[PDB]
């Protein structure tokens, strides 16, 4: 979901 977990 990516480094900052912004992919829901």
């Amino acid at each position, epitope marked *: 979901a990516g*480094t900052y977990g912004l*992919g*829901d």
Partner: antibody
Framework: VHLVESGGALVKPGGSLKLSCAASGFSFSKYGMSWVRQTPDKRLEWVATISSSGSRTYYPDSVKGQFTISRDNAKNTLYLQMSSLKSEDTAMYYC??????????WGQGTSVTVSS | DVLMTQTPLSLPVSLGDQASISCKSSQSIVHSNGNTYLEWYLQKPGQSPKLLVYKVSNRFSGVPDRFSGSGSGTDFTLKISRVEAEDLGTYYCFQGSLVPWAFGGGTKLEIKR
């Protein structure tokens, strides 16, 4: 890999403005996105971040409740609504996507001038 | 709010030279999940910022290996082994570990004479 901001303009103190960011060259609905602005002194300030679906929004104290980030994944477009603008909001406004870092790729920016 | 301070303000180099830029935080950027979200951005004159390094030492896609990031806790460094014309511009560090997200004030890589 293409990000194009728009909506920048001359606006009076107290006024409002809606910025847009048209994206292409990647899966739009996969990435969280952000707005960052550059003031005339060339300082960078993080303005807002939104999750891939639009479910989650994040703001610094300075613009909380005054700015609103949103997105339309069907139209591959990111938005920034700004209200009660003051001279200090005069800046270049950049949209970006996040993956490996906070802002992996940046657009060319759109210019906002707040003045009467 | 954690503060990011960069030194020096301006770094005069000759093309060919090694360069070192420092970035310090007012508090530890080490996140509770074990990561340190320290990032470096380059803004070339008249252009938008670009990502160079993320998570302290990971080079972003396309970034040549003459760039290297290091450091820990509060003290961080970006090094350039041999400076090329394309490297001239303003380097900003960035922290993503703590709320709110913050940029350093920038370091200008410029020409020595």
């Amino acid at each position: 890999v293409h990000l194009v901001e728009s909506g920048g303009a001359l606006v009076k103190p107290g006024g409002s403005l809606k910025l847009s960011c048209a994206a292409s060259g990647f899966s739009f609905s996969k990435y969280g996105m952000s707005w960052v602005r550059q003031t005339p002194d060339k300082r960078l300030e993080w303005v807002a971040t939104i999750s891939s679906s639009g479910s989650r929004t994040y703001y610094p104290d300075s613009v909380k409740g005054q700015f609103t980030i949103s997105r339309d994944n069907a139209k591959n477009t990111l938005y920034l609504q700004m209200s009660s603008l003051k001279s200090e909001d005069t800046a270049m406004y950049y949209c970006s996507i996040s993956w490996d870092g906070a802002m992996d790729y940046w657009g060319q920016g759109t210019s906002v001038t707040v003045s009467s | 709010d954690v503060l990011m301070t960069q030194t020096p303000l301006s770094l005069p180099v000759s093309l060919g030279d090694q360069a070192s830029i420092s970035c310090k935080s007012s508090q530890s950027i080490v996140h509770s999940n074990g990561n340190t979200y320290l990032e470096w951005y380059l803004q070339k004159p008249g252009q938008s910022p670009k990502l160079l390094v993320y998570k302290v030492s990971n080079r972003f896609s396309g970034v040549p290996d003459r760039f290297s990031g290091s450091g820990s806790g509060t003290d961080f460094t970006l090094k350039i082994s041999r400076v090329e014309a394309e490297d001239l511009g303003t380097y900003y560090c960035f922290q993503g570990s703590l709320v709110p997200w913050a940029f350093g004030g920038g370091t200008k890589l410029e020409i020595k004479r």
